[PDB]
Structure formats: C-alpha cells, structure tokens
Amino acid sequence: AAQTNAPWGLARISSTSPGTSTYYYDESAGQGSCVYVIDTGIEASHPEFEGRAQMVKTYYYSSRDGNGHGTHCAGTVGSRTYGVAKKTQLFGVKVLDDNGSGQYSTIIAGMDFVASDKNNRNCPKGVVASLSLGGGYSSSVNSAAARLQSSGVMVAVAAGNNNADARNYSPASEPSVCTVGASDRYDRRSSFSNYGSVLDIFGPGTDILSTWIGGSTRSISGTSMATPHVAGLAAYLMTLGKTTAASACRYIADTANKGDLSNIPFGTVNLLAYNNYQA
C-alpha cells in the first residue's frame, strides 16, 4: 500500500533514502495487534482513530487527554493519516496529568497495569507499549519496564531530550527495553536527542505531524515522537509474523538502515528504523 503526501517520518520508515514523501506498507497494517500508549491519555473520539482507540486506565480525575501529548503519540502509532500501523488497536493509560507530569509511582503502576491488562484484551498478533516519558535514573522505574517487557510486551521508550547520555535517565536506561533516539528529515541526529550505548534505534523525531486534541493536528519534536514510530513499527512487524514481542527491538535493529545518520556520537548505534517493505 502507498500513502501519498505522508508525514516525512512515515515516508522515512519505509525508505532507504531521506527526502521522499510516500509511505509504503503492507496493508495488514498492524491488524490484530495492540499498542498501549502510556502518557497523558488519548482523545479517542478523534476521527483519525476510527474507533480503534480507547482509554483503559487513568490515575487522575479524568481519562481525557487535556494536554495533547498522548494523543499526538498515539496518532503516530496508529492514526489513519499520521500512523505507522493504521489498523492496530490503541489503548490509552493516563499516567501523566494534563501538564504532562507524573509521579514515578504512578508510572510504575501503569506499567504493571499493562502487563496484566493485556490478558483482558484481544491481541492475537502481539502487544506493544509506547512510553514517551522519562526522568532521572530510577532503578524501580527501570525494573517496572523490565517486568513489562518480560511479561510479553514489546516496550519502546524515549531516550530523552537532554542531548546527553541516556544512561542517567529512566526508563531510557533499562537495557532490556527498546530505547529510541530521534532523527530529523535530513538524517541528522535531532539536536535534543539523548545518545549513548543504551540506545537501540533511532526514529523520526523532529517536526512530526500527528493528531492533537480538539480534533486537530500539529507538528512537534522530541524523542517522544520517535518512540511511537518504533512502537507502531513493532506492531506492524508482529502482525506480519516477522518478529515477536521479545525480539522485536533486536529485529528492528537488525533490519534498520545502517550508517545513514550524521552527528551520531562515537559509541552510539547508527541505526534508523525501517520496515523493509518491498511494494
């Protein structure tokens, strides 16, 4: 399938080269998979989600996304126009308040929630969790992400926007999850992207158009935007039977575009997420 005039990041994920604008993908489109977006919530009524998004948990007085961040990330995972996996099921877990903040104890609870809650959902092709959030190093936050991964969920986490080594941030520094840095449309490391040995992969993160609250759209930048590209790619590949939740991060690294990014620090992987789809 071909989506013309796609957001640059979608086109990048299905291309061996930067500078194109058509997204190519297998029409299965993540059908039968599930992606949990652990964030500020999801505006599930947005027409771009087509009824495929729902809130399953909040730790606040509302499940509504009063910020936009979670809706934007969910849109990159699976919205019809802005999403990588356009037929996946999206589940919202609101661990961040409408200012985009959350206590680590709530984030931990949300991760353990997903590990159990997937057993209440129909996801025959596999389960993914996208965590566009983080803070300073916490062994308890890392352990929560490790448990979620161990339980059979492909966990993708943002590397962070500190232009620093991700080893000092959580859950970015947990080795067993998929830690995602950000690149721009010219295949440069995003200026804000964290780096380091713990990164597994890069995805498009600078100037990413996606859904926003109020039934709108906007373009924003961050490793928060790169992470749902990888989460959606994992769901897409699992639906295709190419990989599993346990191995999807490694498979994405194995099949990535290699050596194409600039300003990658010595010791950081030079790997850009790629669906290797041959139309």
Side-chain angles (χ1 to χ4, degrees), residues 247-265:
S247 292
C249 190
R250 180 183 289 165
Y251 178 92
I252 283 161
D254 286 345
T255 58
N257 278 311
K258 309 179 178 26
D260 291 342
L261 301 170
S262 64
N263 200 33
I264 299 294

PDB file of all heavy atoms in Angstrom, residues 247-265:
ATOM      1  N   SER A 247      11.557 -10.166  20.768  1.00  0.00           N
ATOM      2  CA  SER A 247      12.686  -9.981  19.875  1.00  0.00           C
ATOM      3  C   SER A 247      12.524  -8.802  18.931  1.00  0.00           C
ATOM      4  O   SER A 247      13.423  -8.559  18.121  1.00  0.00           O
ATOM      5  CB  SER A 247      12.918 -11.260  19.057  1.00  0.00           C
ATOM      6  OG  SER A 247      13.376 -12.302  19.898  1.00  0.00           O
ATOM      7  N   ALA A 248      11.419  -8.058  19.020  1.00  0.00           N
ATOM      8  CA  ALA A 248      11.139  -7.037  18.015  1.00  0.00           C
ATOM      9  C   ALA A 248      12.191  -5.934  18.008  1.00  0.00           C
ATOM     10  O   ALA A 248      12.570  -5.449  16.937  1.00  0.00           O
ATOM     11  CB  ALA A 248       9.756  -6.441  18.249  1.00  0.00           C
ATOM     12  N   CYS A 249      12.661  -5.500  19.185  1.00  0.00           N
ATOM     13  CA  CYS A 249      13.675  -4.448  19.215  1.00  0.00           C
ATOM     14  C   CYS A 249      14.929  -4.902  18.489  1.00  0.00           C
ATOM     15  O   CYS A 249      15.488  -4.170  17.669  1.00  0.00           O
ATOM     16  CB  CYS A 249      14.021  -4.063  20.652  1.00  0.00           C
ATOM     17  SG  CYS A 249      15.048  -2.583  20.755  1.00  0.00           S
ATOM     18  N   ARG A 250      15.384  -6.117  18.790  1.00  0.00           N
ATOM     19  CA  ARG A 250      16.570  -6.671  18.145  1.00  0.00           C
ATOM     20  C   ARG A 250      16.354  -6.836  16.645  1.00  0.00           C
ATOM     21  O   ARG A 250      17.261  -6.587  15.839  1.00  0.00           O
ATOM     22  CB  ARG A 250      16.905  -8.013  18.799  1.00  0.00           C
ATOM     23  CG  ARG A 250      18.119  -8.719  18.250  1.00  0.00           C
ATOM     24  CD  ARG A 250      18.288 -10.070  18.938  1.00  0.00           C
ATOM     25  NE  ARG A 250      18.726  -9.925  20.325  1.00  0.00           N
ATOM     26  CZ  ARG A 250      18.672 -10.891  21.236  1.00  0.00           C
ATOM     27  NH1 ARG A 250      18.181 -12.086  20.923  1.00  0.00           N
ATOM     28  NH2 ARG A 250      19.102 -10.658  22.471  1.00  0.00           N
ATOM     29  N   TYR A 251      15.157  -7.263  16.249  1.00  0.00           N
ATOM     30  CA  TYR A 251      14.845  -7.414  14.832  1.00  0.00           C
ATOM     31  C   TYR A 251      14.851  -6.067  14.124  1.00  0.00           C
ATOM     32  O   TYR A 251      15.355  -5.949  13.002  1.00  0.00           O
ATOM     33  CB  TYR A 251      13.483  -8.089  14.671  1.00  0.00           C
ATOM     34  CG  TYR A 251      13.042  -8.247  13.242  1.00  0.00           C
ATOM     35  CD1 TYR A 251      13.335  -9.400  12.534  1.00  0.00           C
ATOM     36  CD2 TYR A 251      12.333  -7.240  12.588  1.00  0.00           C
ATOM     37  CE1 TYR A 251      12.938  -9.552  11.219  1.00  0.00           C
ATOM     38  CE2 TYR A 251      11.921  -7.386  11.281  1.00  0.00           C
ATOM     39  CZ  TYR A 251      12.228  -8.541  10.596  1.00  0.00           C
ATOM     40  OH  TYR A 251      11.849  -8.699   9.285  1.00  0.00           O
ATOM     41  N   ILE A 252      14.287  -5.041  14.760  1.00  0.00           N
ATOM     42  CA  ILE A 252      14.283  -3.710  14.163  1.00  0.00           C
ATOM     43  C   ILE A 252      15.711  -3.195  13.992  1.00  0.00           C
ATOM     44  O   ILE A 252      16.053  -2.602  12.960  1.00  0.00           O
ATOM     45  CB  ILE A 252      13.411  -2.763  15.011  1.00  0.00           C
ATOM     46  CG1 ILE A 252      11.931  -3.037  14.747  1.00  0.00           C
ATOM     47  CG2 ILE A 252      13.729  -1.319  14.708  1.00  0.00           C
ATOM     48  CD1 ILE A 252      10.969  -2.506  15.819  1.00  0.00           C
ATOM     49  N   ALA A 253      16.571  -3.420  14.992  1.00  0.00           N
ATOM     50  CA  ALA A 253      17.977  -3.043  14.857  1.00  0.00           C
ATOM     51  C   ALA A 253      18.652  -3.841  13.748  1.00  0.00           C
ATOM     52  O   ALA A 253      19.412  -3.280  12.949  1.00  0.00           O
ATOM     53  CB  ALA A 253      18.714  -3.243  16.185  1.00  0.00           C
ATOM     54  N   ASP A 254      18.365  -5.142  13.664  1.00  0.00           N
ATOM     55  CA  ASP A 254      18.990  -5.991  12.648  1.00  0.00           C
ATOM     56  C   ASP A 254      18.632  -5.535  11.236  1.00  0.00           C
ATOM     57  O   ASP A 254      19.453  -5.644  10.315  1.00  0.00           O
ATOM     58  CB  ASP A 254      18.563  -7.446  12.829  1.00  0.00           C
ATOM     59  CG  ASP A 254      19.224  -8.133  14.030  1.00  0.00           C
ATOM     60  OD1 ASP A 254      20.213  -7.612  14.583  1.00  0.00           O
ATOM     61  OD2 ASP A 254      18.726  -9.211  14.386  1.00  0.00           O
ATOM     62  N   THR A 255      17.407  -5.043  11.040  1.00  0.00           N
ATOM     63  CA  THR A 255      16.898  -4.697   9.717  1.00  0.00           C
ATOM     64  C   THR A 255      16.879  -3.191   9.471  1.00  0.00           C
ATOM     65  O   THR A 255      16.339  -2.742   8.453  1.00  0.00           O
ATOM     66  CB  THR A 255      15.489  -5.275   9.527  1.00  0.00           C
ATOM     67  OG1 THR A 255      14.616  -4.781  10.550  1.00  0.00           O
ATOM     68  CG2 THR A 255      15.510  -6.793   9.616  1.00  0.00           C
ATOM     69  N   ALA A 256      17.475  -2.409  10.365  1.00  0.00           N
ATOM     70  CA  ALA A 256      17.461  -0.960  10.260  1.00  0.00           C
ATOM     71  C   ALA A 256      18.305  -0.481   9.083  1.00  0.00           C
ATOM     72  O   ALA A 256      19.166  -1.192   8.556  1.00  0.00           O
ATOM     73  CB  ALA A 256      17.976  -0.339  11.555  1.00  0.00           C
ATOM     74  N   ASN A 257      18.055   0.760   8.675  1.00  0.00           N
ATOM     75  CA  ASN A 257      19.001   1.455   7.818  1.00  0.00           C
ATOM     76  C   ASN A 257      20.249   1.770   8.640  1.00  0.00           C
ATOM     77  O   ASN A 257      20.157   2.410   9.692  1.00  0.00           O
ATOM     78  CB  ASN A 257      18.382   2.729   7.260  1.00  0.00           C
ATOM     79  CG  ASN A 257      17.512   2.477   6.053  1.00  0.00           C
ATOM     80  OD1 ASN A 257      17.913   1.798   5.107  1.00  0.00           O
ATOM     81  ND2 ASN A 257      16.302   3.029   6.080  1.00  0.00           N
ATOM     82  N   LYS A 258      21.409   1.321   8.164  1.00  0.00           N
ATOM     83  CA  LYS A 258      22.650   1.368   8.928  1.00  0.00           C
ATOM     84  C   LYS A 258      23.578   2.444   8.384  1.00  0.00           C
ATOM     85  O   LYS A 258      23.804   2.517   7.169  1.00  0.00           O
ATOM     86  CB  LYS A 258      23.366   0.017   8.884  1.00  0.00           C
ATOM     87  CG  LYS A 258      22.499  -1.168   9.253  1.00  0.00           C
ATOM     88  CD  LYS A 258      23.290  -2.470   9.147  1.00  0.00           C
ATOM     89  CE  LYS A 258      22.470  -3.684   9.564  1.00  0.00           C
ATOM     90  NZ  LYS A 258      21.000  -3.478   9.394  1.00  0.00           N
ATOM     91  N   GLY A 259      24.127   3.258   9.283  1.00  0.00           N
ATOM     92  CA  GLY A 259      25.163   4.205   8.917  1.00  0.00           C
ATOM     93  C   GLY A 259      24.700   5.417   8.139  1.00  0.00           C
ATOM     94  O   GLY A 259      25.534   6.100   7.535  1.00  0.00           O
ATOM     95  N   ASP A 260      23.401   5.726   8.156  1.00  0.00           N
ATOM     96  CA  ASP A 260      22.852   6.823   7.370  1.00  0.00           C
ATOM     97  C   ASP A 260      22.729   8.132   8.139  1.00  0.00           C
ATOM     98  O   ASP A 260      22.505   9.177   7.515  1.00  0.00           O
ATOM     99  CB  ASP A 260      21.471   6.448   6.833  1.00  0.00           C
ATOM    100  CG  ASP A 260      21.527   5.359   5.779  1.00  0.00           C
ATOM    101  OD1 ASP A 260      22.610   5.127   5.204  1.00  0.00           O
ATOM    102  OD2 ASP A 260      20.474   4.750   5.518  1.00  0.00           O
ATOM    103  N   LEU A 261      22.856   8.108   9.466  1.00  0.00           N
ATOM    104  CA  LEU A 261      22.656   9.294  10.282  1.00  0.00           C
ATOM    105  C   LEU A 261      23.969  10.012  10.545  1.00  0.00           C
ATOM    106  O   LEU A 261      25.024   9.389  10.707  1.00  0.00           O
ATOM    107  CB  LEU A 261      22.007   8.930  11.618  1.00  0.00           C
ATOM    108  CG  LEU A 261      20.646   8.243  11.507  1.00  0.00           C
ATOM    109  CD1 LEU A 261      20.217   7.707  12.862  1.00  0.00           C
ATOM    110  CD2 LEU A 261      19.590   9.199  10.948  1.00  0.00           C
ATOM    111  N   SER A 262      23.884  11.332  10.616  1.00  0.00           N
ATOM    112  CA  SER A 262      25.019  12.175  10.953  1.00  0.00           C
ATOM    113  C   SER A 262      24.927  12.660  12.399  1.00  0.00           C
ATOM    114  O   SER A 262      23.868  12.644  13.033  1.00  0.00           O
ATOM    115  CB  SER A 262      25.108  13.365   9.992  1.00  0.00           C
ATOM    116  OG  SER A 262      23.979  14.211  10.107  1.00  0.00           O
ATOM    117  N   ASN A 263      26.081  13.079  12.915  1.00  0.00           N
ATOM    118  CA  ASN A 263      26.245  13.557  14.287  1.00  0.00           C
ATOM    119  C   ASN A 263      25.798  12.518  15.306  1.00  0.00           C
ATOM    120  O   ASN A 263      25.233  12.852  16.351  1.00  0.00           O
ATOM    121  CB  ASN A 263      25.532  14.884  14.537  1.00  0.00           C
ATOM    122  CG  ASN A 263      26.085  15.602  15.764  1.00  0.00           C
ATOM    123  OD1 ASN A 263      27.279  15.499  16.065  1.00  0.00           O
ATOM    124  ND2 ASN A 263      25.225  16.303  16.487  1.00  0.00           N
ATOM    125  N   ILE A 264      26.076  11.257  15.007  1.00  0.00           N
ATOM    126  CA  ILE A 264      25.909  10.168  15.963  1.00  0.00           C
ATOM    127  C   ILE A 264      27.209  10.042  16.752  1.00  0.00           C
ATOM    128  O   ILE A 264      28.262   9.768  16.146  1.00  0.00           O
ATOM    129  CB  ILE A 264      25.569   8.851  15.261  1.00  0.00           C
ATOM    130  CG1 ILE A 264      24.252   8.985  14.491  1.00  0.00           C
ATOM    131  CG2 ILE A 264      25.519   7.727  16.273  1.00  0.00           C
ATOM    132  CD1 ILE A 264      23.032   9.187  15.355  1.00  0.00           C
ATOM    133  N   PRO A 265      27.193  10.240  18.066  1.00  0.00           N
ATOM    134  CA  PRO A 265      28.440  10.152  18.836  1.00  0.00           C
ATOM    135  C   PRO A 265      29.075   8.773  18.771  1.00  0.00           C
ATOM    136  O   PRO A 265      28.401   7.748  18.686  1.00  0.00           O
ATOM    137  CB  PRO A 265      27.998  10.489  20.264  1.00  0.00           C
ATOM    138  CG  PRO A 265      26.787  11.312  20.091  1.00  0.00           C
ATOM    139  CD  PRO A 265      26.094  10.790  18.877  1.00  0.00           C
TER     140      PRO A 265
END
